[PDB]
XYZ file of N, CA and C in Angstrom:
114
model
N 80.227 57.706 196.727
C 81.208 58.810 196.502
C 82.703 58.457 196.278
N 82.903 57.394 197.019
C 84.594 56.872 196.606
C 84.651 57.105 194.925
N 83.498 56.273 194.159
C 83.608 56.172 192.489
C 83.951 57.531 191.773
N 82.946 58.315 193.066
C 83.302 59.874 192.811
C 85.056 60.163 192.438
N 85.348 60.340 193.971
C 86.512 60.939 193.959
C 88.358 60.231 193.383
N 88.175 58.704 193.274
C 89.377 58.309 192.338
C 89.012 58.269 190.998
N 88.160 57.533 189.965
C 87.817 57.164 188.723
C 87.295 58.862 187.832
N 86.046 59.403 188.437
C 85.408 60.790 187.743
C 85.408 62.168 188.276
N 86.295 62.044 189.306
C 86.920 63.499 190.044
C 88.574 63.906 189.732
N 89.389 62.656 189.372
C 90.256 62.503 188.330
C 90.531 63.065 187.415
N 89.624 63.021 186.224
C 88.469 63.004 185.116
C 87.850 64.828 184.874
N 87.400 65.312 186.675
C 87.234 66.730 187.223
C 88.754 67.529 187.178
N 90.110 67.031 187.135
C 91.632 67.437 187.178
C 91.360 67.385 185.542
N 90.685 66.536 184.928
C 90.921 67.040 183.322
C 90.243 68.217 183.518
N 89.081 68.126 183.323
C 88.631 70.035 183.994
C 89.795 70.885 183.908
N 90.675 70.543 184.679
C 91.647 71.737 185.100
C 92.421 72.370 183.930
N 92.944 71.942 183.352
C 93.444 72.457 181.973
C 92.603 73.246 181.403
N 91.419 73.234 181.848
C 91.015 74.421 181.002
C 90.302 75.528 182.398
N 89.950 75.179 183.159
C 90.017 75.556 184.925
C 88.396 76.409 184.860
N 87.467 76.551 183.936
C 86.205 77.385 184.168
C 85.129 76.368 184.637
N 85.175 74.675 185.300
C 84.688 73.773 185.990
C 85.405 73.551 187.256
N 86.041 74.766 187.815
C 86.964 74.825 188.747
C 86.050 74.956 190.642
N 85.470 75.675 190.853
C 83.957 75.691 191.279
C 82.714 74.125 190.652
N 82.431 73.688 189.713
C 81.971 72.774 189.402
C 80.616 71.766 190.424
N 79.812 72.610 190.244
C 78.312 72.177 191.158
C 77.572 70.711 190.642
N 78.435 69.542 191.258
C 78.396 68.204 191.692
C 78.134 67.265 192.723
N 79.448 67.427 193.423
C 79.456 66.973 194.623
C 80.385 67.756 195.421
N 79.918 67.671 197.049
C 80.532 68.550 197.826
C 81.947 68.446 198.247
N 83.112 69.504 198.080
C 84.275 69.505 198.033
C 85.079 67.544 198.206
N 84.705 67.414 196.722
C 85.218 65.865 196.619
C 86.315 65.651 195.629
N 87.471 66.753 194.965
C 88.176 66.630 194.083
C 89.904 66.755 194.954
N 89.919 67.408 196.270
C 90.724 67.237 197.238
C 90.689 65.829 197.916
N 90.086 64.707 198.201
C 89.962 63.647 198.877
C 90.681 62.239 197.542
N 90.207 62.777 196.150
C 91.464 62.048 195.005
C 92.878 62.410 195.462
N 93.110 63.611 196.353
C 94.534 63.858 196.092
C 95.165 63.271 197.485
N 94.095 62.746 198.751
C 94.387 62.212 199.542
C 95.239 60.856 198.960
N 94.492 59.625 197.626
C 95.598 59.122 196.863
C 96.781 59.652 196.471
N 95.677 60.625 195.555
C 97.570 61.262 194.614
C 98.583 62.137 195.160
């Protein structure tokens, strides 16, 4: 899950620009723990 959340949860913030993968049924609340980096 680390690969998860810096390298392709990152990647999930591209998502965001368009925000309807915002919810996104993957992995469990793992796009907050990238921002523990950022």
């Amino acid at each position: 899950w680390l690969i998860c959340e810096e390298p392709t949860c990152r990647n999930r913030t591209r998502h965001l620009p368009l925000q309807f993968s915002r919810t996104g049924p993957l992995c469990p609340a793992c796009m907050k723990a990238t921002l523990q980096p950022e």
